Amino acid sequence: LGKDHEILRRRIENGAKELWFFLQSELKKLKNLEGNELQRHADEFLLDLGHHERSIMTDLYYLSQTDGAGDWREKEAKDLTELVQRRITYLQNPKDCSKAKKLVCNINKGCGYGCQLHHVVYCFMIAYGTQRTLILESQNWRYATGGWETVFRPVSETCTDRSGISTGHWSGEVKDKNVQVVELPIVDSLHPRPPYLPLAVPEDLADRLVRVHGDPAVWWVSQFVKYLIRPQPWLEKEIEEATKKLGFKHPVIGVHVRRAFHPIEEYMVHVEEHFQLLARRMQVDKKRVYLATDDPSLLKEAKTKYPNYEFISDNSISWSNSLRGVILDIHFLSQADFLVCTFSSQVCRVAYEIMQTLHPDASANFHSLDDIYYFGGQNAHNQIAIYAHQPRTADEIPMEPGDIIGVAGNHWDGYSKGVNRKLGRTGLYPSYKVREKIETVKYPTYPEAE
Amino acid sequence: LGKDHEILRRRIENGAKELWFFLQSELKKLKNLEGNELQRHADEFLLDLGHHERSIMTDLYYLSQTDGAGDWREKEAKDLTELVQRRITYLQNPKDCSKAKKLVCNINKGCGYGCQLHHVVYCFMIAYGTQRTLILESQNWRYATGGWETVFRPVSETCTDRSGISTGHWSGEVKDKNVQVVELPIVDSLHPRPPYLPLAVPEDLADRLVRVHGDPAVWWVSQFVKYLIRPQPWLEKEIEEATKKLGFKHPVIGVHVRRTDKVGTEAAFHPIEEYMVHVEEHFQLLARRMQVDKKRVYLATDDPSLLKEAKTKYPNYEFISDNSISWSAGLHNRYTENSLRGVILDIHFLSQADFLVCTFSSQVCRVAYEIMQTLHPDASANFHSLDDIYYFGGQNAHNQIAIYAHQPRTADEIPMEPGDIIGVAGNHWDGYSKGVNRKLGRTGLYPSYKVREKIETVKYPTYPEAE
Numbered sequence: 060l061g062k063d064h065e066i067l068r069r070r071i072e073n074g075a076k077e078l079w080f081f082l083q084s085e086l087k088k089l090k091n092l093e094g095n096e097l098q099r100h101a102d103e104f105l106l107d108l109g110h111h112e113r114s115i116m117t118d119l120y121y122l123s124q125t126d127g128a129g130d131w132r133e134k135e136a137k138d139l140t141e142l143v144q145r146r147i148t149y150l151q152n153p154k155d156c157s158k159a160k161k162l163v164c165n166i167n168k169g170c171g172y173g174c175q176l177h178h179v180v181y182c183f184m185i186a187y188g189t190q191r192t193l194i195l196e197s198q199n200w201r202y203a204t205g206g207w208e209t210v211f212r213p214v215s216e217t218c219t220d221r222s223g224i225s226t227g228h229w230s231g232e233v234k235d236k237n238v239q240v241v242e243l244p245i246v247d248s249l250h251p252r253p254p255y256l257p258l259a260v261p262e263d264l265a266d267r268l269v270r271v272h273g274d275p276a277v278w279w280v281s282q283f284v285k286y287l288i289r290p291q292p293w294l295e296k297e298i299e300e301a302t303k304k305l306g307f308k309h310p311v312i313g314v315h316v317r318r319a320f321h322p323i324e325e326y327m328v329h330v331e332e333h334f335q336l337l338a339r340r341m342q343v344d345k346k347r348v349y350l351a352t353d354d355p356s357l358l359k360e361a362k363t364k365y366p367n368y369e370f371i372s373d374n375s376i377s378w379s380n381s382l383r384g385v386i387l388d389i390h391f392l393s394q395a396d397f398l399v400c401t402f403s404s405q406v407c408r409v410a411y412e413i414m415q416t417l418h419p420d421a422s423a424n425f426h427s428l429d430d431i432y433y434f435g436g437q438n439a440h441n442q443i444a445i446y447a448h449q450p451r452t453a454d455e456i457p458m459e460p461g462d463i464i465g466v467a468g469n470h471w472d473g474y475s476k477g478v479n480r481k482l483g484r485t486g487l488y489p490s491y492k493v494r495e496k497i498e499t500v501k502y503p504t505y506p507e508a509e
Numbered sequence: 510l511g512k513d514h515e516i517l518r519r520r521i522e523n524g525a526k527e528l529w530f531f532l533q534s535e536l537k538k539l540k541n542l543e544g545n546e547l548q549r550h551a552d553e554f555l556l557d558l559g560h561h562e563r564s565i566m567t568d569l570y571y572l573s574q575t576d577g578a579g580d581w582r583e584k585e586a587k588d589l590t591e592l593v594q595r596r597i598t599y600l601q602n603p604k605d606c607s608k609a610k611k612l613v614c615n616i617n618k619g620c621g622y623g624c625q626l627h628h629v630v631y632c633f634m635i636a637y638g639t640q641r642t643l644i645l646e647s648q649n650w651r652y653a654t655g656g657w658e659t660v661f662r663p664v665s666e667t668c669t670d671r672s673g674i675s676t677g678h679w680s681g682e683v684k685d686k687n688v689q690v691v692e693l694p695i696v697d698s699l700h701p702r703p704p705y706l707p708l709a710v711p712e713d714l715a716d717r718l719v720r721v722h723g724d725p726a727v728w729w730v731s732q733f734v735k736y737l738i739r740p741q742p743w744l745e746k747e748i749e750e751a752t753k754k755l756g757f758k759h760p761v762i763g764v765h766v767r768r769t770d771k772v773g774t775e776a777a778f779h780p781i782e783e784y785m786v787h788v789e790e791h792f793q794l795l796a797r798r799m800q801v802d803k804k805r806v807y808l809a810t811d812d813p814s815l816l817k818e819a820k821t822k823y824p825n826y827e828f829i830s831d832n833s834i835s836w837s838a839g840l841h842n843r844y845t846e847n848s849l850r851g852v853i854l855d856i857h858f859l860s861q862a863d864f865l866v867c868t869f870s871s872q873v874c875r876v877a878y879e880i881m882q883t884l885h886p887d888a889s890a891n892f893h894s895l896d897d898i899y900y901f902g903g904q905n906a907h908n909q910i911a912i913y914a915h916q917p918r919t920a921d922e923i924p925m926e927p928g929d930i931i932g933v934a935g936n937h938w939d940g941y942s943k944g945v946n947r948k949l950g951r952t953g954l955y956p957s958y959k960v961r962e963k964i965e966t967v968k969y970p971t972y973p974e975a976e
């Protein structure tokens with residue numbers, strides 16, 4: 060079993076049991092207070108609970124590493140990504156470009172960099188699913204006159220032209236089985252939708268992925284992000300020089316403030332709380348925050364309000380134009396130990412996706428002030444109720460074990476919101492009473508890549 | 510790495526994180542309420558928290574069993590107990606009793622059955638530690654004139670006579686090395702004390718025991734209880750027949766309500782409701798993972814009127830109890846073979862239950878809890894005590910080690926730094942324990958989660974010839 064594994068499991072269990080003893084006793088006392096005394100005691104109660112809750116979280120972290128688990132998870136995550144990158148690379152580099160099935164993707168969607176990048180990711184996932192080589196059209200790119208390849212590696216070494224014996228607009232994989240070159244539109248108008256879309260995961264990888272990673276959907280998205288953003292040597296060098304110039308070092312928490320309005324304190328409470336967690340398992344000499352924002356006055360405000368934090372930020376005037384800022388910001392957010400921001404932002408999502416490629420399982424190393432993780436155009440995100448729920452208020456929905464719940468969001472207060480598809484009712488339910496429903500799709504497995 | 514293990518670990522982690530989201534949000538709302546509305550919301554809050562906390566505990570239970578862990582823990586616990594029983598049996602059965610080193614123990618300490626049995630255990634552990642065959646003197650035992658063997662097997666198949674070429678009172682292992690027969694008195698005045706006492710565990714078993722079991726000290730005590738209470742054939746048949754006549758079936762929770770002479774002197778009176786709160790909560794835990802058709806309680810008590818009171822107050826529970834045994838425990842009748850049979854049976858069924866609610870100040874409940882350790886791989890946490898933590902009368906000081914610093918909020922609390930040795934007096938079951946910080950010489954309250962147990966070890970003989 061492992062002595063440390065057993066010691067830690069029992070200490071998590073006893074720690075939670077002592078938490079419950081404490082909760083019952085203190086809540087019973089809180090019932091008899093009022094006014095200011097009630098607030099004093101409730102606030103002390105909260106402070107005590109936080110440290111206690113973090114000791115449980117710290118033991119759970121140690122449990123995840125103990126008795127070789129950390130090393131095994133790292134090796135397996137490495138094997139999985141090398142497997143997928145090998146398949147993508149095999150698909151992308153046919154020997155005869157003239158006879159390859161192709162899918163043509165135009166990068167120049169009318170939106171920002173993160174949205175354009177996710178459009179290429181969506182093209183790539185469908186190309187992978189249909190066994191078509193992705194051809195990326197990037198001329199007249201707003202972010203770089205020379206196009207994609209002046210900044211990132213070409214998505215193929217052997218096949219970058221869209222020539223073929225037959226060309227057509229996407230009409231479905233079977234309908235298109237004999238069209239060599241298929242042009243794919245933006246996801247918003249895609250008809251018919253193939254199954255090769257988030258949040259599903261390939262069947263042949265699903266079992267291994269669940270063993271390794273807490274959100275396989277994001278891991279799967281991130282393999283395509285990883286391949287796409289292979290940087291040219293000069294950009295790799297620029298990122299290296301910025302790291303030294305900015306003093307970007309660990310531990311560091313990334314904060315992306317996109318401008319509902321959220322005040323800086325709403326981000327920073329989660330920053331501080333995560334640094335308290337980290338201090339239980341490592342020495343934190345300086346609390347470093349990488350701040351990405353489109354508000355030029357926010358940086359000054361953060362430094363003044365949090366003088367014990369070192370705020371690192373990118374105020375690049377030139378390279379050593381907006382493309383420079385977004386690349387550096389996404390890079391440093393993705394490299395942080397924890398990410399605080401609103402997943403409604405594509406930039407925040409991109410950083411979180413890239414972060415998955417830097418650790419065996421970074422799925423939980425974020426806090427979003429609004430949305431849960433999603434991919435624009437994804438199929439319905441469903442959960443499965445595991446425990447019954449009886450609504451206490453009219454804003455809550457009932458659940459029985461097995462009910463399919465279409466989740467709209469997590470309110471980060473103990474409750475989530477969604478629709479109970481068995482009942483046709485929408486409302487609030489306790490977040491702990493459902494589990495994620497991992498969707499799978501039969502993808503090609505490209506055995507020839509091995 | 511096993512898939513279920515990973516799924517469960519993550520759900521425990523996410524379950525706790527959601528618990529913390531819920532705590533912060535709901536406490537913020539409670540701060541703005543007062544009076545009756547505050548009391549209603551607090552009570553709903555408590556109800557919601559209980560189900561949520563039990564989901565976390567249920568996932569932790571599954572984690573302990575998953576991916577072969579349950580099978581492995583069961584086999585290793587079985588290998589450990591077979592090893593120790595084999596060593597004890599080897600010690601207890603020398604080839605020539607007339608040439609064997611012996612330790613003589615008299616069962617008739619001036620106290621009740623559990624205290625007397627624990628005296629024999631203390632004798633036995635010292636005999637095992639000193640490589641002396643235990644000789645149990647039990648004639649004129651207050652519970653049975655005919656002695657231990659009227660109910661239990663003799664503690665040896667080959668060596669029950671106390672004779673030898675030399676006999677002496679205990680004076681220590683080195684001094685007594687050439688005394689064939691050593692007489693051991695009660696623990697209260699033993700000098701010099703040997704190290705073979707609770708709560709320490711043998712060095713040679715400590716690592717394996719920490720791997721399998723949440724309280725090795727009790728497991729070690731329980732091996733000697735297990736050997737001692739091997740039943741005579743007639744008692745074995747009686748226990749089997751009582752099991753069938755009582756309808757004793759699982760799941761069942763054992764409740765020992767000790768009253769009579771215990772109250773005031775060594776413990777307090779506790780009303781039935783204080784026991785049943787913990788019974789009800791544990792059945793709520795069990796219903797998470799199994800079907801509970803009937804909520805069964807095995808009630809052992811020295812109060813004969815309690816059974817009817819309990820049935821009336823808890824009409825949806827099935828109370829399994831022998832009310833003639835409760836009467837047999839009355840003070841005037843207590844030291845009789847009738848009463849002995851009753852307390853052996855009550856302790857047996859308590860020990861067989863899936864969970865135990867009692868007052869550990871009573872030796873009866875501690876015996877049941879010790880026996881329970883021999884029936885499961887790790888039953889160390891399957892109790893709730895209304896007063897004391899587990900202890901063994903005569904043990905060496907029970908110490909803990911602070912793992913997280915504590916800064917006192919009230920005058921009743923003690924400070925702690927990591928590494929401080931804390932002498933625990935008790936757990937108040939409210940988040941705080943009480944003890945002395947030995948570094949500071951200060952006594953008071955500290956958060957129970959901020960210490961770990963200090964497992965003590967002693968070099969014992971290993972009887973390699975027993976293999």
Ligand SMILES: Nc1nc2c(ncn2[C@@H]2O[C@H](COP(=O)(O)OP(=O)(O)O)[C@@H](O)[C@H]2O)c(=O)[nH]1
Pocket residue numbers: 620621622623624625765766767768771809810811834835838843848851852853855870871872873
């Ligand atoms: N059968 C039975 N006898 C009991 C019960 N409670 C107390 N007694 C009797 O009272 C004695 C109490 O002495 P002891 O075992 O040393 O435990 P303590 O006095 O409770 O710490 C027991 O040994 C029994 O003889 C009970 O629940 N059932």
